[PDB]
Amino acid sequence: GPAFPGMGSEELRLASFYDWPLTAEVPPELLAAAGFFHTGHQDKVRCFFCYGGLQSWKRGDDPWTEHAKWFPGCQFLLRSKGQEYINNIH
């Protein structure tokens, strides 16, 4: 199951980005959709399912792409995007 079941709701994840410092650069909507919640410190986020953390986001970074790049074994990623998507990023 998920590492952090309490953040399984996309809406709750989205709410966590109220203080996100990079709204124009990396949309909270896309981050939340990709399983990420905001830790509250800087631009650090974490996936609710695999608990993978990502920081130092660059403008135009795609949350789903980054999820697959760094945490290809995440089952939420797999269920959401499929194996073909993950394979093509590598």
Ligand X SMILES: CN[C@@H](C)C(=O)N[C@H](C(=O)N1CCC[C@H]1c1nc(-c2cccc3ccccc23)cs1)C1CCCCC1
In three-state secondary structure terms, 45 is strand
In three-state secondary structure terms, 3 is coil
Find the shortest distance in angstroms from Cβ 66 to ligand X: 5
Gap between the Cα atoms of 35 and 76, Å rounded: 8
Cβ proximity to ligand X, 18 vs 56, nearer residue: 56
Cβ proximity to ligand X, 39 vs 75, nearer residue: 39
Is 50 a residue that touches Zn ion (CB under 5 A)? yes
Computed on alpha carbons and rounded to an integer, the radius of gyration of the chain in Å comes to: 12
Listed in order, strand segments (DSSP E) in 1-90 are 36-38, 45-47, 53-54
Q: Which residues bind ligand X (CB under 6 A)?
A: 39, 44, 46, 53-58, 61, 66, 70
Find the shortest distance in angstroms from Cβ 44 to Zn ion: 15
Is 74 a residue that touches Zn ion (CB under 5 A)? yes
DSSP state for residue 89 in the 8-state scheme: H
Cβ proximity to Zn ion, 24 vs 65, nearer residue: 65
Is 31 a residue that touches Zn ion (CB under 5 A)? no
